Enzyme design. Sequence first.
Site: not given
Ligand SMILES: C[C@@H](O)CN1CCN(CC(=O)O)CCN(CC(=O)O)CCN(CC(=O)O)CC1
Ligand SMILES: C[C@@H](O)CN1CCN(CC(=O)O)CCN(CC(=O)O)CCN(CC(=O)O)CC1
Ligand SMILES: [Cl-]
Length: 129
Positions: A35, A46, A48, A50, A52, A59, A101
């Site tokens: 990295e 990046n 978009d 953003s 890193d 990022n 995450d």
């Molecule tokens: C906890 C992390 O997941 C935070 N997250 C990191 C990047 N995520 C990785 C992925 O979701 O596995 C990809 C983009 N993510 C898709 C989605 O969440 O559906 C939308 C934005 N998320 C909204 C949320 O997560 O509450 C905020 C940032």
């Molecule tokens: C931003 C949302 O994604 C938040 N999210 C609720 C909606 N997601 C929909 C999907 O993941 O796009 C339900 C399915 N999700 C699968 C997965 O994330 O592993 C369960 C666990 N997530 C943990 C996290 O997201 O990291 C719970 C919170």
């Molecule tokens: Cl930037």
Amino acid sequence: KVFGRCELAAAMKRHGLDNYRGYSLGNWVCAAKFESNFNTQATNRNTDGSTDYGILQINSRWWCNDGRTPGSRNLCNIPCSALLSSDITASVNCAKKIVSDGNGMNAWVAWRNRCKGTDVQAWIRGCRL
Ligand SMILES: C[C@@H](O)CN1CCN(CC(=O)O)CCN(CC(=O)O)CCN(CC(=O)O)CC1
Ligand SMILES: C[C@@H](O)CN1CCN(CC(=O)O)CCN(CC(=O)O)CCN(CC(=O)O)CC1
Ligand SMILES: [Cl-]
Ligand SMILES: [Cl-]
Ligand SMILES: [Cl-]
Ligand SMILES: [Cl-]
Ligand SMILES: [Cl-]
Ligand SMILES: [Cl-]
Ligand SMILES: [Cl-]
Ligand SMILES: [Cl-]
Ligand SMILES: [Cl-]
Ligand SMILES: [Cl-]
Ligand SMILES: [Cl-]
Ligand SMILES: [Gd]
Ligand code: NA
Ligand code: NA
Ligand code: NA
Ligand code: NA
Ligand code: NA
């Protein structure tokens, strides 16, 4: 700061990154190598708009604030510049959030493409940890 390999391994271990979310220390050292080449001051823009930052190329879309990624989040609640410090605490603490995450270390492109499925223990070989 440009870390030596074992120096970085020791710092990461001290900060509890070793075996974090089940990822052994060699995974993290390998990720950092590809990295940032172990350089805390590494930055990369990046497509978009953003950027890193730091030894694990965290990022600004989601994780830190740099004031130039409109509409982004700051989930680690830090300025991105904190990820450039010689002290890796901020990068490590933020990396822990990232790898928790859902996607694990696949969040790091370079890890998936150059570390995953390989002998990662090689990256801490020879170190006194
Ligand atoms: C906890 C992390 O997941 C935070 N997250 C990191 C990047 N995520 C990785 C992925 O979701 O596995 C990809 C983009 N993510 C898709 C989605 O969440 O559906 C939308 C934005 N998320 C909204 C949320 O997560 O509450 C905020 C940032
Ligand atoms: C931003 C949302 O994604 C938040 N999210 C609720 C909606 N997601 C929909 C999907 O993941 O796009 C339900 C399915 N999700 C699968 C997965 O994330 O592993 C369960 C666990 N997530 C943990 C996290 O997201 O990291 C719970 C919170
Ligand atoms: Cl930037
Ligand atoms: Cl070293
Ligand atoms: Cl592992
Ligand atoms: Cl290892
Ligand atoms: Cl830079
Ligand atoms: Cl970083
Ligand atoms: Cl911003
Ligand atoms: Cl700019
Ligand atoms: Cl800030
Ligand atoms: Cl450090
Ligand atoms: Cl995982
Ligand atoms: Gd997300
Ligand atoms: Na794991
Ligand atoms: Na941001
Ligand atoms: Na700002
Ligand atoms: Na901040
Ligand atoms: Na840092």
